[PDB]
Amino acid sequence: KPRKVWIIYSADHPLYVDVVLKFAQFLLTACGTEVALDLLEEQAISEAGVMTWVGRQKQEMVESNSKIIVLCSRGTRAKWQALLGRGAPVRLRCDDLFTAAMNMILPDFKRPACFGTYVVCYFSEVSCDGDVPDLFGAAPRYPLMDRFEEVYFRIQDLEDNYLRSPGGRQLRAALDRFRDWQVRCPDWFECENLY
């Protein structure tokens, strides 16, 4: 049985969604890791609840000793602030499973035994440390891809080089493309936010 993983993220813009999908594919084609990703299960999410689906993903990871990757970004920051009632609610065009997933995993962060399940990341090219919700507090943060090595170790239970691995250049092209856009359109996030 290959390593399985659940990716949690905020769908901030079609370009960042593509970054996320390319990462998922990199994990599969470069690391032989199976990924639970909401993009890939729209039907299941449709029929079962969104809460039912999120609850089902977490359950499968924890009981199989598999990791939950938290991908942090501009949207995870804003959605967390909203959850805290210290920022307006967010209504993103691409949406909200990140908020649902945050509700689901929340209690785990008063449980030290549960921290090793979570792998807290953000892509340094398009996102920043300040994007990580303080819910994760003292959990290690991995700037990707600078520190993907460490994330790999955790996914594998152990103890720009990825560009030559299958799917690495595609992920990097996706990163570059979103980055250039944030430069071209600095208010990209605010444009994604409806009402």
Numbering used by the authors: 376 to 470, 477 to 540, 556 to 591
Task: Copy text from the publication.
A unique intracellular signaling domain termed SEFIR is found within all IL-17 receptors (IL-17Rs) as well as the key adaptor protein Act1. The IL-17 receptor (IL-17R) family comprises five members (IL-17RA to IL-17RE) with considerable sequence divergence, which are all membrane-bound proteins containing single transmembrane domains. IL-17Rs contain fibronectin type III (FnIII) domains within the extracellular portion and a unique structural motif within the cytoplasmic tails termed the SEFIR [SEF (similar expression to fibroblast growth factor genes) and IL-17R] domain.
Here, we report the crystal structure of a fragment from the IL-17RA intracellular signaling domain including its SEFIR domain and a short C-extension at 2.3 Å resolution. One is a six-amino-acid short linker (residues 471–476) within the CC′ loop. The other is a 14-amino-acid linker (residues 541–555) connecting helices αE and αE′. The longer helix αF is sandwiched by two short helices, αE′ and αG, in a Z-shaped crank shape. This predominantly helical C-extension of SEFIR packs tightly against helices αA and CC′ins and loops CC′, DD′ and EE′ through extensive van der Waals interactions, stabilizing the overall architecture. The most striking observation when comparing the two SEFIR structures is the absence of the knot feature in IL-17RA SEFIR. Together with the short helix αD, it rotates almost 90° with respect to the IL-17RB SEFIR structure and shifts by more than 12 Å, making sufficient space to accommodate the αCC′ins helix. The results here implicate that the αC helix of IL-17RA is the most critical region within the SEFIR domain for its heterotypic interaction with Act1 and is essential for IL-17A signaling.
